[PDB]
Design a protein around this ligand. Structure first.
Ligand SMILES: [Fe+2]
Ligand SMILES: [Fe+2]
Ligand SMILES: [Fe+2]
Ligand SMILES: [Fe+2]
Ligand SMILES: [Hg+2]
Ligand SMILES: [Hg+2]
Ligand SMILES: [Hg+2]
Ligand SMILES: [Hg+2]
Ligand SMILES: [Hg+2]
Ligand SMILES: [Hg+2]
Ligand SMILES: [Hg+2]
Ligand SMILES: [Hg+2]
Ligand SMILES: [Hg+2]
Ligand SMILES: [Hg+2]
Lengths: 340, 341
C-alpha cells in the first residue's frame, strides 16, 4: 500500500506529519511546519567536506598518546562510527515510508545524508592516524562493550520497520499469516513510531554529546586538533538533528497534528522516561570500559557520569519529561567553548 | 529479516551488491567496487545551491513567451519536478533495504539526496516565474499528459518494495495470507530488482535528457537563462547518476557479482528491451502533444523525436541491449554546449 508517487491530488498542508497519504510532489513553496524547511536550509548551509580538513598532525599526537589514552580516543571514535553508521541509513529506511508532508520528508533525507558525511569523516580520521583501519572498523560489530553501550538502537528501528511493512502489506486488522494471527493496529504502529523517535532524540541529544566530551577533552589539552575541528563540525550538525527530533516530538504531543498521537504520547510517557534513563545509564557504564587501563587528568568516570546526568536532564526537559537526576551545573563548561 | 545493524561480523568486500547481509559499518577505507566511492566523491564535489542562481529575469521572459511556448516550458518543468520527486525518495526506500555493501549504500543515499536539491531548485524557478506556484504544483499529480509520459516508473519501484517486504517478513517459500497463497521467490525478487534498475537507468538515461533538450532550446535563444543555469547543474548530476545505474546493471548481468542474477537478466532481456523502448515511446508521445498547439523556436516534434532515438540507442547499447532504432549522428549537437558532461 506504499507508493513512490501517490496519485491522489491531496492538500499537503493538511496531512499529518506521519501516516497520511505518502508524499507525491516535492515542493518547498509552502509548509505545514516551516521549522522543517528552516532546518533543511541551515543544514545545507553548513555543508562541509572532511577531506578538506587537515588531520596531518593528529597522527603525531596520537602516536605520542599513552596507550590508555589511545584506547580511550579510539573506543570513542568507534562508538561515533557506530551511531552515524546507523543514523545514516535508519531515518530513511524507517521514516520515509511513513512521512506525509514534503518538508519533513526532505528534512529526513537531508538529516540522514549529513550523517553519511560524519561517517566519511571518521574514515578520514582513522586512516590518517592508524596503520590499518580494518582493525578499528572490524572491532565495532563485535566489541561487546560497544554493542552493550549501543544496545537497543537497532531494535526500535527494526521493529518499527517490521510493523510498518505489515501495515503496508496487510492494512489494519487481524490477519492470518501461515496459520498464525497477526494483528495490525495503527494506534500501535503510531506508538512504535513515537517511541523510536524519542529513542532517536536520545541518541542525537545525549549519546553523541557524551562522545563529544571525550573528543574535546584531548582538544583542551591541545592534542588531536584535526579530530576536534571535525567533531565541532559534526556537533554543529547533530544540534540541528536534535532540534528536529524535539520539534517532531513536541508537535506530536501538542495534539496540533494527529490528535491520536497526543493521547499516545500521554499513554507512553513512562516508557519515554524509561528509555532515556536506560540510555543515560548505558553511557555511564561505558565510562567503566573507557577507563580500563586508566583515565586522564581531565576526565574520569565521575566527571563523565556527572556530565551525562547533566545533559540528560536538559534534554528530557526539552521534551516535557520529568528529570531523573539531581539538578546540577555543567560539570564541564569549557566544553561549551567548542559546542557553540 | 531486515536489520539497521547486522550483528554478524562480515567481510563487506565479499558480499554481493544486493541481497547479502544488510550493511552494518559505514566505512570508506576500502571497497569491493570503487566506482561507487568515486561517484560519491564527485557528487560531493558538485554540491550547488539553487538559491544561488539568479532567475530574476526569467519572469518577464516567460511572460513574454507565446502561449504554446509557456505551455511547453511549464509542461517540461512539471515533468522534471515529477521525476526528481520520485528520485528523491525512491532509491532510498527501494534499494537501501536490499544493499549489502557500504559504498553502494552511501552512493544511493548521496544520489537521492542530490535529487532533492534538484527539487528545491524547481521550487526556486517556479516561485520566480509565476504569481502562485500552486498553480503549477497542483497540476502535476493529475496532469494527464504528465502521468502518461511518466507512466510505469512508480509501478516498477512499488512492486519491488512490495516483494521486498514480503521477502523480509516471510522469507522464501509458499505461504498463506488471509485465505490466499502468497509465493515468495528470491529469483523473482532478483528479477524485479533488475527490471526496476533498468527502468531507473532509462529514466536517468533518457527521460531527463529529453527534458534537457527542451529547456536548453530556450537557452539557445537567450531565454529563461536562470532556469538554464539550474538545468545545467542538474544535468551534470544526472550524468553521474546514469554512470551509477550503468555500472550496477553491467556488474549484475556480467555474472561477476551474482551469477544467478546474470542468468535472470539474460532470461528477461526482451522484457528489458521492451521497457526501454516503451520509455522512448512515451517521450516521443509527449513531444507529439507538446508541439501540436504550436512548435517552439529551434525545436519541434521531429528533431526532438530524432534526439530520443539517438540517445536511446546509445543508452541501450551501454547496458547490452539491441539498438531499437536507426543509427544516426546527434541531431542537436548544440545541446553539447549545455551538457558539460
Ligand atoms: Fe552524525
Ligand atoms: Fe545526527
Ligand atoms: Fe535529478
Ligand atoms: Fe538522477
Ligand atoms: Hg526512529
Ligand atoms: Hg528508533
Ligand atoms: Hg576523552
Ligand atoms: Hg566523555
Ligand atoms: Hg512514549
Ligand atoms: Hg512522552
Ligand atoms: Hg524502478
Ligand atoms: Hg529501482
Ligand atoms: Hg522546449
Ligand atoms: Hg530484464
Amino acid at each position: 500500500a506504499y507508493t513512490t508517487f501517490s496519485q491522489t491530488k491531496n492538500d499537503q498542508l493538511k496531512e499529518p506529519m506521519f501516516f497520511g497519504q505518502p508524499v507525491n510532489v516535492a515542493r518547498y513553496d509552502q509548509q505545514k511546519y516551516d521549522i522543517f524547511e528552516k532546518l533543511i536550509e541551515k543544514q545545507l548551509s553548513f555543508f562541509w567536506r572532511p577531506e578538506e580538513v587537515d588531520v596531518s598532525r593528529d597522527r603525531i599526537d596520537y602516536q605520542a598518546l599513552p596507550e590508555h589514552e589511545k584506547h580511550i580516543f579510539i573506543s570513542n571514535l568507534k562508538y561515533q562510527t557506530l551511531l552515524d553508521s546507523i543514523q545514516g541509513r535508519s531515518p530513511n529506511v524507517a521514516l520515509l515510508p511513513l512521512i506525509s508532508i514534503p518538508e519533513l520528508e526532505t528534512w529526513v533525507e537531508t538529516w540522514a545524508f549529513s550523517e553519511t558525511i560524519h561517517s566519511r569523516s571518521y574514515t578520514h580520521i582513522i586512516r590518517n592516524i592508524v596503520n590499518d583501519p580494518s582493525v578499528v572498523f572490524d572491532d565495532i560489530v563485535t566489541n561487546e562493550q560497544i554493542q552493550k553501550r549501543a544496545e537497543g538502537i537497532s531494535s526500535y528501528y527494526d521493529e518499527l520497520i517490521e510493523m510498518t511493512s505489515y501495515w503496508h502489506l496487510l492494512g489494519e486488522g487481524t490477519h492470518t499469516v501461515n496459520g498464525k494471527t497477526v494483528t495490525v493496529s495503527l494506534r500501535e504502529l503510531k506508538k512504535k513510531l513515537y517511541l523510536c523517535l524519542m529513542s532517536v532524540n536520545a541518541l542525537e541529544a545525549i549519546r553523541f554529546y557524551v562522545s563529544f566530551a571525550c573528543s574535546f577533552a584531548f582538544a583542551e589539552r591541545e592534542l588531536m586538533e584535526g579530530n576536534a575541528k571535525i567533531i565541532r563540525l559534526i556537533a554543529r550538525d547533530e544540534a540541528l538533528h536534535l532540534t528536529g527530533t524535539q520539534h517532531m516530538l513536541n508537535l506530536l504531543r501538542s495534539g496540533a497534528d494527529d490528535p491520536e498521537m497526543a493521547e499516545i504520547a500521554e499513554e507512553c510517557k513512562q516508557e519515554c522516561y524509561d528509555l532515556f534513563v536506560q540510555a543515560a545509564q548505558q553511557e555511564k557504564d561505558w565510562a567503566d570500559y573507557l577507563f580500563r587501563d586508566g583515565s586522564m587528568i581531565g576526565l574520569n568516570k565521575d566527571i563523565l557520569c556527572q556530565y551525562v546526568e547533566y545533559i540528560t536532564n536538559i534534554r528530557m526537559q526539552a521534551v516535557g519529561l520529568d528529570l531523573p537526576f539531581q539538578t546540577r551545573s555543567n560539570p564541564i563548561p569549557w566544553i561549551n567553548t567548542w559546542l557553540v
